Every structure is written in C-alpha cells, then in structure tokens.
C-alpha cells in the first residue's frame, strides 16, 4: 500500500506521469511484478498545511507499507529511487519531499 | 538520421498550396499529401536537414501558422530507422519472442503530436514499435503499440504521457499476454 | 445453437484491455476486436454457453459497465445459422425467387442492439436475411434487409420495432419489386 | 448530350424507397444507389430526357421535397462527355502537356451542387477536368481540379464561385507548376 | 378507411408497432394487398373522456369502413383479429377496446 | 356534415382557400343554399399515419353525410367536384385524396 | 481507529449501510462494546489511482489500528469478517478489497 | 403466513373507486380505507394469496399505476405474526426484560415502503418490534422501533437501510438504556 499526500493544482497529465514513474521505480527497485504493486494518492488544500512556519508552500509526503526481509541497503535504494522519481516527476526540490515507510509485520499484512 | 516535416491542415486546398510552395523553395521529396478522416489534409516531407528546415520556415510564412488553419506542424531533424517501414507502408512487425514483455498502448487526437511523442520516447527510451495506424478508417485518431521490459515500458509510458500532455486522449498498459492473445492481442 | 458476445466501447484501449481479460478467464475464440467508424471499438466473441457467460460477467466486472465507457453489451446463448455466413464475411444471399415477396428495411444507431433485434425477430418470426452491413464505411450505423410474405414481413416489422425501441433510427417497407429493381433493389 | 438525376438524402431507407418508386415509373437505368460518409444516401440515374424528367417529378412528389429529408436534388438535361469517365469510375486524366497551364481547385459541402457547378462551368467555360473525387473517404466533401489558360482559368473560377454561392467551402488557384509537382501536384 | 381514437402518452415506437401490427392483421384477415389498405388514428386528452362513470381511464376505439360481400363469419374474424392485435400491441385489456365497422354501400365507396 | 382529415403543416391562407373552394364546389354541385352547408376539418400528426407501407407521406380524406333522393349520377358529380377542388386547392395528386360519403337515413338526419 | 479509502460515486444509502455492517462485523468479531468502536472513511478521485497497470478501476482499502493481546486466529477472524462485510456491502469482488491492520503498542494507544 | 396489500393514493376518491373495484373482483376483507395526514388515502387489504394477487393486478389495471396518482403500492405474500397486533390496533409491546438490548429507530417518508422494509428486515433478521405508529398525527411519516442484541440490531439496521434506500428520511441507534429511560425511552 502506498499513500501520497500532494498539493492541489496539478494537471491530469502531471499526476498521470507521476503514477507511471512511481510504479516504474517501485517495480525496478523491489523487483516485484506489477501484479502486487498498488499505489494511492490524494491532495490537500493549499491554505491547509504548515511547513516550518510557512503556510501555503507545497509539500509532498510518501507513505509506504512494506514487508520485512528486505535488507537496509535495498530499503535505502527504494527510498532514493522514490525520492528521485517524485522530484523529477513534479520538478519540486527534494527538500519538499518527505518519504516514509512502515514494515508491516508478517502476521499483519 | 534523416529528418521529417508534418503538416496537418483543415483548408486542404490551402494545404495543396503550401505544399506546392514548399517544393517551389526546395527539392524535397513528397511522402504523402492526402486527405484523411474526418476530412483533414496530411502532408509528409523528408530530405536534407537544412533543406527541410528552410522549406519549413518558408511553408510557415506561406500558410500563416497560428491563424487557425494549421492544426499542428511538427519539425524533426533526426528520425528513428524503424519508423520508415511503419511510415511508408503498413509493415507488420515480427511477433514477440519473449512472453514476459509487457505491452503499452496510447491514443492522442492528432497524428503530428502522436509521432512527436513517438520520436521523443524513442530518443529518451530504447523501445520498439510493433503495430501502428495513422488517420485511416479511424475518424482522425492514430495508434501505435509498444512492447518490452516492465521498467522500460513504464518509463516510456511516463515519457510519452509527459510529451503528449493535453493531446493525449487515452493510455493503457497490458501486464501479461498468454498465447490466446500472444500474437492475438 | 451457438452463443455470441458483443462489446461496443469508446475507450478502445480499454476495450483491448477488457478483451484481454475476457480471454484470460476463458478459452473463447475471437471473431473481431477492431475499431470502426466513427471511432468505436467492436468486439465479437463466441464459444461454449457457460464459458461465454462466465467470461461475460468477468468482462462486465473488469470494464465497469454503466459508467459510460460501454455503449452497449449484448449477450445471447442461441444464434441463428444464417447469421454465421453474414457475420463472418459479406456473403451475398441467393437472389429472390418469388417476386411477390415484400421487402423490409430497418436502421438503428448501434450494432449491438441491431443484432439483438435481428435475433429477436428470427426467434419470434421465421424470416430470412438477404443483405446486411455493419459499421464499415457507414459512420457507425448498420443495416440488414428482410424479405418474405406480407403477413410475415409485417409481423416481423412489428417485432423488430418493439425490440429496437428508442435504438431505432428509421424503418421502411417496400411492397413490390419488379425486374428493374428485382435483384437491382 | 445525355441527362442526369442526383438525389442526396438523409433517411437512406427513404432514399431506397424513392429510388424504387422512380424506377416504378420509368425504365431509367441506375448508376449508384449507395450510402457514403458521413452516412448520406447518394442516388444517380440517367436515361432519356423526358423519361428522366417525369421520373424526377414523380420522385419529388414521392419523397416530399422541402421537408428536410432531401439535402439536394439536381436535374440536368445535357451533360458533358468527359464527365462520364469521371463519374462512372476513377479515370486518371492524361498528364498536363503544357507547364504554362495554371491550376484551379474548389471545395463545396454537397456533391449535387458540386457537379451542378461543374456542369455550369463547362457550359459557360471551355475547361477540362483532371482529377475528381466524390464522397468517398472524405467525410461528405467532394473535389475536382481544373487546368488551363490564365484567362480561361480565372473566368471559370468566377463562374464556379457564382454558381456555388453559399455551397462553397473553399477555393484556391495555383499559378505555376514545375516538375517537382508537375504531375506530382 | 380506418380511424382509431386512442389516449395520449404513448411512445412513438409503441404506436409505430401498433400501426404495423394492425396492417398485418387487416391484410392477413381480409386478404387484400397492401395497395388498398389505409389506416388513420388520432389521440384525445386524458381528462376528456368518460368511461362508465369514470374519467381519465384509457379507452381505445376502432372504426372501420368496409365493402359488402363479406360473409358474417369473416367479419367476425376481422373483428377478433383487430381486437387481439390492438390488445397485444398496447397491453390494455380487451374490455377497453371497442371495435366498430360500417358497410360502405357499393354505390357509395 | 363534412369532416376532412388532413396533414399538419399548411398555411392559414391555404386551408382558408381550401374551405372556400370546397364550399363553392358543394353548393354548385348539389344546388343547396349556403344556409344549409356545413364543413369541418382537422389535422393529424405526420408521424402518425400509414399509407401502403409508407409512413409520413401525406393523405387527405373526405367524409360527407348526405341525404337520400340524389341519383347516382349527381353523387358521382359531387365526388368528382370534391376531388378536383381539393386537389387543385392543395396541389396534391388525386391518388392521395380519398373521398367517402354516407347516406344519412331520412328518419336519421 | 479505522480509515477506509473508497472510490467516489456511491449512494448515501450505500455507504450508510456499509458503515452499519462494518460496525456490526467489528463488534461481533472482537467482542468490544459499541462505546469503543470508531470508524472513519474517505473517497478518492476515479482518475487518481492505479491498480496493476490499470487506472480508473475501483479499489477499496481498509486500515485498522488494534491493540495487542489478540491471538493470530482471532486476527484472521477479524480480517475475514471485514473482507466479507465490505464485499457484500458494495458488491465488489474480494480481489478489489485490501485489508490491513497495525498493532498499536500498549505504550502508544 | 397471511398476505397483505397496501395502497397509497392522492386522488382519494379514485382510491375509493379502486378499492371498490378490488372488492368487485375478490372477496378480500377490508382493513382500513381511510385518509390520513397530510391528506393521503391509505388502503389495507388481506386474504388468500392468489385471491389477493389477482385482486392486486386488477386494482393496478384500474388505477393506472405509474401515472402519478399512486404514491406506492406494495404486495407481500407472507407477513409476520407480530405485525397483526401492531397493524390492527396500537398494541403496546411488553417492556424490555434485558437492559443490554440496544435500540434501533428509523424514519421513512411513505408507510408502504416503511412496512416493506419492516417485513424485509423480519425475513432477513430475527428482530422484534416494540413501538410503532402509522400516518396518524404525524404529517404523513411513520415510525417503528426495534430492540435486541448489538450484532442483530446492527445487521438489521444495515438491511433496513438497504431496503429503504431513498425512501429513508432518518435513522438512529441507541446503545444503552438505563431505568430513567428503560421503559421511559
């Protein structure tokens, strides 16, 4: 499961390409087939978020739910790939993309 | 790496006129100056890079680009080899040899931007065309399918979406074929 | 009495996708997965009754029937023999042998409902097809002519009107031919 | 100098009916009773002058001209010889022998008025047709090109504009060809 | 000549099929060719007719003008065919269809 | 009593002249004064009538209610006069005008 | 805490019944009173999500936050009950419902 | 398991007429043919299953269902025993014996659909009615309360919501009573 929080005001082409590129990065990094890769995202109001004493500046956040058994190095590879993919997809500086993932316990997923 | 020039016009007699003027200026060969569904004139020309370019600006001056008569005009200096068998005639591609290759399909409203996106994807992504169709028995649309590796297919999809932009009308991805559609897709 | 499944779609890449999924589920042969004027995807499939049916509901689930992407979807378990020569290819019917046979002609907007009405008339009325045309060089329409006895022709007209309903676009009845149109209708 | 009768209809089953009635009245041969893009019925008939005329008024009475079902109906008693090779089939004209001959091109929405203007120009102006196309793979339009002397070409353009009137959709004049389009226009 | 009085509120397909079926029944019963069979009908306001102390209930009436020389049995056959045809055409009970015909004198038609 | 069924789509001048000409023909043929000549007509929908397997083609029908004592020859004269009058009035071919009359019994009118 | 992501285009009655049935399943499975059962859900744009190379197809996701001490068998019972409840509530195949839960640490909830 | 027939009409004289016709056809007893707030005619009938059914279709034919005169008409072959004491008269239910039983309350605009949902819930869910009120001193609404186990109450709520659909106007759930409202709810 992926949930991505993004600001509003993006063209349908832009988020469409964002979806394709994120799927590409995930599949190439973790090596899973397309059959088990799911992605979901939603937007928030521009006048709604705060970023370090500033309000209205854009901020993209990534949340991942991933299964254990992945070594830390490939976890870092996933993190870097996701960051670069999103940044190139929407041309926003990497300081505005915060990526976070959670190890879903094997008894849990 | 040859060049190409594409002209999509509505006043197709004016398209005839602009084609005549373009060949007045230059000894550029003609590929197709024909009307297609739903009644739009399509012009394809190729030749020497500088020759094609100067003929192109002459044609732009003649046809008054931007006044609404010109739907789209696309210039390109370098074109892919596999394009030529597809563009010149309906050339069936060899059947896929690896079932793992996922499939990509797109659809945009105008042919000029269609091949513009195709060339952009080819330059950006090493992918291979399989089936293609332009402006014939279609109502003005155009199609071309792609195949290959999951990562390559997905990045090519991203690139083609970016280039097409609002010209895009639809896109789809087929994960896996099996012999009931492998070759029978 | 074989079965048939017909799919009329607008997002024709989505039509490709739904056809691929349908054959994922079932070993149902393909008749035609092609786009036609004015740019609509037409899909025809046939096979075992239960196989066709389960593939049909799978396709309905996949394509999200009712959201506007699907113009029409028609399922039928039993189909008439004379349909097959007409559906597979343009098969000219034998010329009329009795000049007394009056003629019937119809026109509806969508092919799926067209053949639905055709099958309904055939089940309800013993009438024989002569000429037929589907979605080619037509702008999306479809035609099929009928001949026979006055009473049979009129009751078939009533049945086909009832079944077509709002799908109908036109209907006409020719009382009598004579050799200047007998065979030259 | 043979005659011609042309019928452009929208309710094409009604066009079938009116054609049947017309041949009920008269032993007039049929040239083409066919539907074309974008879904309009075209009927062409020829025969004896008085026979064609009386069949024409019978057809007008039958089809209720003026109620909107009839796009255009054009009657003509005398038709040009060079029309017949063009009308019957796509007959390529001999290539131009004098490069000085300027070229004329027109475009109107309806075929009936198109050939009406063509015949009017031929009667008024001694000019010769080269290329022509009617209602096929065009979306309903029609084209025909003319060649000849500057003065003759210009006066023919004036005449055809006058006759076409609001039916006209576009017109263009090519002053001079050269071998890159001479024959390759 | 046929004149049929019907209520308003019927689909064009419905009355179209009604016309076809009525023509079918007439032709098959009296054996005349289509060349001499003419049918005409019109509608009336729902708030306009009375039916046995009830107002607004639908009521279909058939009027025929027919030439003599037809035996009573075939007249009854015509009556039955017309009744059944109309009833099946519009799904209204036969008690709401009244069919009536008139023998147009030979010196009259 | 006269009742004439006609299609819709006719100018007020046209049906007005039709009324005058029909009255003229009736009066001159049967010799009755204007004081006892009454005429009524109505229209029907174009998509409503069938004419020999054709729907939408126009069809005019005349119905007359006339008293006995008129010899057949003058009945034919009335029929011919009415037919010609209507045909010239609306320029439709006589094959589209069907004229019919009924002898109202003397104990009946 | 429950958060359910759903597509848009569902009747108020439909999601209302969905809420009731989900509450029913949760209460009957985990045995907690209604006083401590909370559920929240939101929708996303149809043109917004990707599902295995397909865009626009519906996909329902369930997220649960649950306290430890529950044996794996009752966790599976909760999972099955939630899946069946949602599937019957909205008539979508179970392959389109992904259910996920998280054990909120005792020092955390 | 007796049957029931319910008729909600606006032209209440027409309701009188349809009730008279229904008993013309059948020897079905009358329960209530009365007008209620805000001026709507309510008709309740019961009898033998087939007798009730045929009387029902006769009444439907007589009253012209679907023309706007009929707000709702609900037919049911099998009805719950506990309904009869509630329907015939205001029969107070015995007080709740277990305080743990949660409470359910609903509200829909029309009585016919109200009892339709009630019967559907009873068939689907073993739940017991407590208090009920129909169309009297209410402005056209109707109420009925349910009690029981949390799981049973919640599933019954789901079922009743599903059946009521758009007819529903409000719904509410009371988790726990205590003696200040236990019996004094």
B20 and chain D: CB distance < 8 Å anywhere? yes
- Cα–Cα distances in Å, from C97 out to C148, C154, C171? 11, 20, 24
- Cα–Cα distances in Å, from F106 out to E93, F68, F103, G81? 38, 7, 9, 89
Chain D neighbors of F93, CB-CB under 8 A = 61
Alpha-carbon distance of E65 to E2, in angstroms, equals: 6
Give every strand in the sheet of E2-7, ordered side by side.
E97-104, E60-67, E2-7, E38-44, F50-51, F54-55
* DSSP designation for H171: E
- Measured in degrees and rounded to the nearest 5, phi and psi for residue D89 equal -155, 165
Alpha-carbon distance of G92 to G94, in angstroms, equals: 6
CA quadruple C141, C145, C151, C156: dihedral, nearest 10: -40
**C168 Cβ neighbours under 8 A, 6+ residues apart:** C106, C107, C108, C161, E13
**C107 Cβ neighbours under 8 A, 6+ residues apart:** C141, C142, C143, C168, C169, C170, C171, D12, D13
By DSSP bridging, strand C40-46 and strand C102-108 are: unpaired
H helix intervals, chain B: 12-25, 49-63, 83-88, 111-124, 150-164
Chain centroid offset of residue C160 CA: 12
Beta bridge partners of D4: D76
- To the nearest 5 percent, what fractions of chain C are helix, strand and coil? 35, 30, 35
Three-class secondary structure of residue H75 per DSSP: strand
- At least 3 CB pairs under 8 A between chains D and E: no
Query: Burial level of F27, CB count in 10 A (0-12/13-18/19+)?
Result: middle
- Cα–Cα distances in Å, from C110 out to C13, C82, F51? 20, 21, 28
Alpha-carbon distance of D135 to D43, in angstroms, equals: 12
Three-class secondary structure of residue E65 per DSSP: strand
Task: Choose among H150, H168, H173: nearest Cβ to G13.
Answer: H168
Alpha-carbon distance of H185 to H179, in angstroms, equals: 9
Give yes or no for a contact between B27 and B51, defined as CB atoms under 8 angstroms apart: yes
CB atoms within 10 A of CB E77: 16
Under an 8 A CB cutoff, do E1 and F102 touch?
Answer: no
Under an 8 A CB cutoff, do G24 and H155 touch?
Answer: yes
Closest CA to D4 of D62, D80, D59: D80
Give yes or no for a contact between C148 and C156, defined as CB atoms under 8 angstroms apart: yes
Neighbouring subunits of E (3+ Cβ pairs under 8 A): C, F, H
Give yes or no for a contact between H160 and H117, defined as CB atoms under 8 angstroms apart: yes
* DSSP designation for C10: S
Under an 8 A CB cutoff, do C172 and F54 touch?
Answer: yes
Alpha-carbon distance of B182 to B99, in angstroms, equals: 7
The angle subtended at Cα G11 by Cα G10 and Cα G15, nearest 5°, is: 75
> No. of H helices and E strands in chain B?
5, 8
**G64 Cβ neighbours under 8 A, 6+ residues apart:** G1, G2, G78, G82, G99, G100, G101, G102
Neighbouring subunits of F (3+ Cβ pairs under 8 A): C, D, E
Question: How far is the alpha carbon of C59 from chain B, nearest alpha carbon, in Å?
Answer: 15
Alpha-carbon distance of B42 to B112, in angstroms, equals: 9
Give yes or no for a contact between F5 and F61, defined as CB atoms under 8 angstroms apart: yes
Give yes or no for a contact between F8 and F43, defined as CB atoms under 8 angstroms apart: yes
Beta bridge partners of F80: none
* DSSP designation for H165: G
Task: State yes or no: cis peptide before C38, omega within 30 of 0.
Answer: yes
Closest CA to C146 of C166, C168, C169, C126: C126
By DSSP bridging, strand F97-104 and strand F60-67 are: parallel
Alpha-carbon distance of A86 to A83, in angstroms, equals: 5
**Buried b / exposed e across H151-171, counting CB within 10 Å, b at 16+?**
ebbbbbbbbbbbbbeebbeeb
Experimental method: cryo-EM
CB atoms within 10 A of CB B29: 12
Alpha-carbon distance of F18 to F34, in angstroms, equals: 16
Alpha-carbon distance of B67 to D43, in angstroms, equals: 38
Q: Chain F window 20-79: which residues touch C at a Cβ cutoff of 8 Å? A: 52-55
- Measured in degrees and rounded to the nearest 5, phi and psi for residue E24 equal -55, -50
**B31 Cβ neighbours under 8 A, 6+ residues apart:** B44, B45, B46, B87, B88
Task: State yes or no: cis peptide before B38, omega within 30 of 0.
Answer: yes
Mutate: best of H9, H19, H24, H64, partner E, most E CBs <10 A:
H64
Alpha-carbon distance of F99 to F92, in angstroms, equals: 14
Three-class secondary structure of residue D21 per DSSP: helix
Strand ranges (DSSP E) for chain D?
4-9, 29-36, 40-46, 70-76, 102-108, 128-134, 142-148, 168-174
The 3 state secondary structure assigned to chain A is: CEEEEEECCCCHHHHHHHHHHHHHHHHHHHCCCHHHCEEEEEEECHHHCEECCEECCCCEEEEEEEECCCCHHHHHHHHHHHHHHHHHHHCCCHHHEEEEEEEECCCCC
Closest CA to H115 of H76, H62, H153: H76
**D123 Cβ neighbours under 8 A, 6+ residues apart:** D78
Three-class secondary structure of residue D96 per DSSP: coil
Question: How far is the alpha carbon of A82 from chain B, nearest alpha carbon, in Å?
Answer: 14
What is the secondary structure of chain F as a DSSP string?
Answer: -EEEEEES---HHHHHHHHHHHHHHHHHHH---GGG---EEEEE-GGG-EETTEES---EEEEEEEES---HHHHHHHHHHHHHHHHHHH---GGGEEEEEEEE-TTT-
Residue B49 half-sphere exposure, CB side, CA atoms within 13 Å? 6
B128 and chain C: CB distance < 8 Å anywhere? no
Category of B184 on φ-ψ map: left (φ > 0), alpha (ψ -120 to 50) or beta: alpha
Alpha-carbon distance of G64 to G45, in angstroms, equals: 22
- Taking CA–CA distances from B174, the nearest residue in chain G reads G53
Under an 8 A CB cutoff, do G50 and A38 touch?
Answer: yes
By DSSP bridging, strand G50-51 and strand A38-44 are: antiparallel
- Cα–Cα distances in Å, from D112 out to A55, B60, D50, G85? 68, 35, 20, 66
- Cα–Cα distances in Å, from G15 out to E25, E102, G10, G60? 54, 65, 7, 12
Beta bridge partners of E67: E104
Give yes or no for a contact between F98 and F46, defined as CB atoms under 8 angstroms apart: no
Resolution of the PDB structure in angstroms: 4.2
Closest CA to H122 of H162, H83, H169: H83
Mutate: best of F47, F54, F55, F92, partner D, most D CBs <10 A:
F54
Chain centroid offset of residue H102 CA: 22
Task: Choose among G16, G28, G33: nearest Cβ to H161.
Answer: G16
C30 and chain B: CB distance < 8 Å anywhere? yes
Alpha-carbon distance of D174 to B22, in angstroms, equals: 13
- Taking CA–CA distances from G102, the nearest residue in chain A reads A108
Chain D neighbors of F54, CB-CB under 8 A = 17
Q: Is the dihedral of CA G79, G82, G85, G86 positive or negative?
A: negative
Task: State yes or no: cis peptide before G51, omega within 30 of 0.
Answer: no
Under an 8 A CB cutoff, do A40 and G47 touch?
Answer: no
Three-class secondary structure of residue B91 per DSSP: coil
- Helices D12-25 and D49-63: angle between axes, nearest 10 degrees: 140
Residue C106 half-sphere exposure, CB side, CA atoms within 13 Å? 34
Query: Burial level of D81, CB count in 10 A (0-12/13-18/19+)?
Result: exposed
Category of F33 on φ-ψ map: left (φ > 0), alpha (ψ -120 to 50) or beta: beta
Alpha-carbon distance of A20 to A10, in angstroms, equals: 15
Alpha-carbon distance of E5 to E44, in angstroms, equals: 7
Closest CA to A37 of A69, A72, A64: A64
Three-class secondary structure of residue G99 per DSSP: strand
Q: Is the dihedral of CA C27, C31, C33, C38 positive or negative?
A: negative
Alpha-carbon distance of H146 to D65, in angstroms, equals: 71
Helix (H), strand (E) at residue E13: helix E12-30
Residue E27 half-sphere exposure, CB side, CA atoms within 13 Å? 24
Chain G neighbors of C61, CB-CB under 8 A = 93
Alpha-carbon distance of C24 to C28, in angstroms, equals: 9
**Buried b / exposed e across D2-29, counting CB within 10 Å, b at 16+?**
bbbbbbbbebbbbbbbbbbbbbbebebe
Rg over CA atoms, chain H: 17
Three-class secondary structure of residue D18 per DSSP: helix
């Amino acid at each position: 499961m992926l949930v991505v929080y993004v600001p509003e005001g993006y063209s349908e082409a832009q988020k469409r390409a964002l979806l394709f590129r994120l799927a590409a990065a995930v599949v190439e990094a973790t090596g899973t087939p397309l059959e088990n890769v799911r992605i979901i995202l939603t937007t928030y109001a521009p006048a709604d978020v705060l970023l370090g004493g500033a309000i209205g500046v854009p901020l993209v956040v990534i949340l991942v739910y991933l299964l254990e058994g992945l070594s830390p190095e490939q976890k870092a590879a996933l993190v870097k790939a996701l960051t670069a993919a999103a940044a190139e997809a929407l041309g926003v500086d990497p300081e505005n993309i915060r990526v976070i993932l959670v190890p879903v316990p094997p008894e849990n997923f | 790496r040859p060049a190409l020039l594409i002209l999509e016009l509505k006043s197709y007699a004016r398209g005839v006129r602009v084609a005549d003027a373009a060949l007045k200026a230059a000894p550029v060969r003609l590929l197709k100056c024909k009307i297609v569904e739903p009644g739009k004139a399509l012009i394809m020309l190729t030749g020497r890079p500088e020759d094609v370019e100067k003929a192109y600006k002459a044609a732009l001056t003649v046809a008054n680009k931007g006044s609404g008569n010109l739907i789209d005009s696309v210039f390109i200096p370098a074109i892919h080899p596999a394009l030529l068998p597809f563009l010149l005639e309906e050339t069936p591609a060899p059947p896929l040899e690896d079932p793992d290759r996922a499939l990509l399909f797109v659809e945009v409203k105008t042919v000029a931007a269609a091949i513009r996106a195709a060339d952009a994807a080819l330059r950006a992504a090493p992918v291979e065309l399989v089936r293609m169709r332009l402006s014939e028995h279609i109502g003005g649309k155009a199609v071309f399918a792609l195949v290959g590796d999951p990562a390559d297919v997905l990045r090519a999809a991203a690139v083609v979406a970016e280039v097409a932009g609002d010209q895009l009308l639809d896109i789809a991805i087929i994960p896996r074929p099996h012999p009931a559609l492998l070759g029978r897709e």
